């Protein structure tokens, strides 16, 4: 199961100044980058074009190229329409794409956030606000749904273009997506012993403090932290009374090793 995400951030400082930047994820790997500074979307992978022909992509990029300009002007005007309801600074986010399932099936989504709160989605054939949104947004929504052409285009994006594009990506991207990178581990202690695990891919991993063949239940797993080279980092902490560090090790299981658990003794 893979989730394709197009993540948009737009910041509107005042009525004149704004910027819009997007990044594109397929799982936890970045496939595209589109900075406000750039006229074109950049591939961050060799296979980011997926299975589209150059002509198909040229046409798809130009559609976004037109959207970014429009989006920017639209928000700006939607503010003039509500004013003095809402005021700059304004923060818009969009999250769009699809979750791919086996065979043919998928679900496409397009969620919109305003000042860090989820407020609008495209669902079916129209824009709609979600529960908890403010009533004033009903006028923005009445306007956006006025626009038949945008509707047809967005339904195509979500219903047809997304799934097709990604099924194409998963073929071209198979190599990087199924990559196996080994973790490397090291130990240290602060006034609690720490087991550092770094470099593994994929994300699923297991790390425990052990004395022989017994687990240590206090083991507090951290969050997954990313490296710059698209591998993962995580650490485990266990509280110890001073002197008890003897006979302790840190055991790490991961898909990359093939049952060759990492065994670091203190």
């Amino acid at each position, epitope marked *: 199961n893979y989730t394709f995400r197009c993540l948009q951030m737009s910041s509107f400082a005042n009525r004149s100044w704004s910027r819009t930047d997007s990044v594109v994820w397929l799982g936890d790997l970045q496939t595209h980058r589109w900075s406000n500074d750039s006229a074109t979307i950049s591939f961050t992978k060799p296979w980011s074009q997926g299975k589209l022909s150059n002509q198909q992509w040229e046409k798809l990029q130009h559609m976004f190229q037109v959207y970014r*300009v429009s989006f920017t002007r639209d928000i700006q005007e939607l503010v*003039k329409m509500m*004013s003095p309801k809402e005021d700059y600074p304004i923060e818009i986010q969009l999250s769009a794409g699809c979750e791919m399932y086996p065979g043919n099936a998928s679900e496409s989504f397009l969620h919109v956030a305003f000042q860090g709160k989820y407020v609008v989605r495209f669902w079916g054939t129209s824009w709609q606000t979600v529960p908890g949104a403010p009533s004033w947004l009903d006028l923005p929504i*009445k*306007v*956006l749904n*006025a*626009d038949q*052409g945008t509707s047809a285009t967005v339904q195509m994006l979500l219903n047809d273009t997304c799934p097709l594009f990604v099924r194409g990506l998963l073929e071209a991207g198979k190599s990087d997506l199924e990559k196996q990178e080994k973790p490397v581990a090291w130990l240290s202690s602060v006034p609690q012993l720490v087991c550092h695990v770094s470099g593994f891919y994929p994300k699923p991993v297991w790390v425990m403090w052990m004395r022989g063949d017994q687990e240590q239940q206090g083991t507090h797993r951290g969050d997954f932290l990313p490296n710059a080279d698209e591998t993962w980092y995580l650490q485990a902490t266990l509280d110890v009374e001073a002197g008890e560090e003897a006979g302790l090790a840190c055991r790490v299981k991961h898909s990359s090793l093939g049952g060759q658990d990492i065994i670091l003794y203190w």
Partner: T-cell receptor
Amino acid sequence: AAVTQSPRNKVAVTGGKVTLSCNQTNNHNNMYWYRQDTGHGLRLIHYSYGAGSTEKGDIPDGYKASRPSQENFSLILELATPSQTSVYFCASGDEGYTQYFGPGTRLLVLE
Amino acid sequence: TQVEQSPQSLVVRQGENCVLQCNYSVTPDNHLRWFKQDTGKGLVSLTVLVDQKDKTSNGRYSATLDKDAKHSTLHITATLLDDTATYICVVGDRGSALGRLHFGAGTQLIVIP
């Protein structure tokens, strides 16, 4: 879906106050003031998204707007100049793309 | 400017047909509208074209739009004296109130009766 403009014709002097007015009983939220001069297409001056809102258009300079009610949209020239001789058109609309235009108002400003 | 009309002006004898052109650079281009304006008068809408390659008609006026070429032509068939008017081209940014209209300077028609 009708739009009324008054006056339909005005003769004004330089530096004098001229107020063109536009009225629509359609309950349209949105209204727009244009001018038409030979060899240019219509040009937007000011517009509105409702009572109390006025918005600069493309050539706002020399013009002030006023939306005192849903029904009325007024273009005010505080200090009229000869370059403001034109035919002025008012429009209104709901959320849709269609703008319904009034019959136009001719103004002449003389020294 | 972003919307250009041709010919600037033309003279025809009644009964004859004429072709009027609109060429634009507007983006995006939701819809295109052709107006008829009698001298010292108002904007009467003739037709509005919406689709990528679109064709419309209205009595003696027929029109076509091509959004790739970004071009529209308006055909008047069998001209009548009344057709003496300026014909005006307009392109719409959006399919909603959020859009701005982009006006041509017109084509002036004279029909000799």
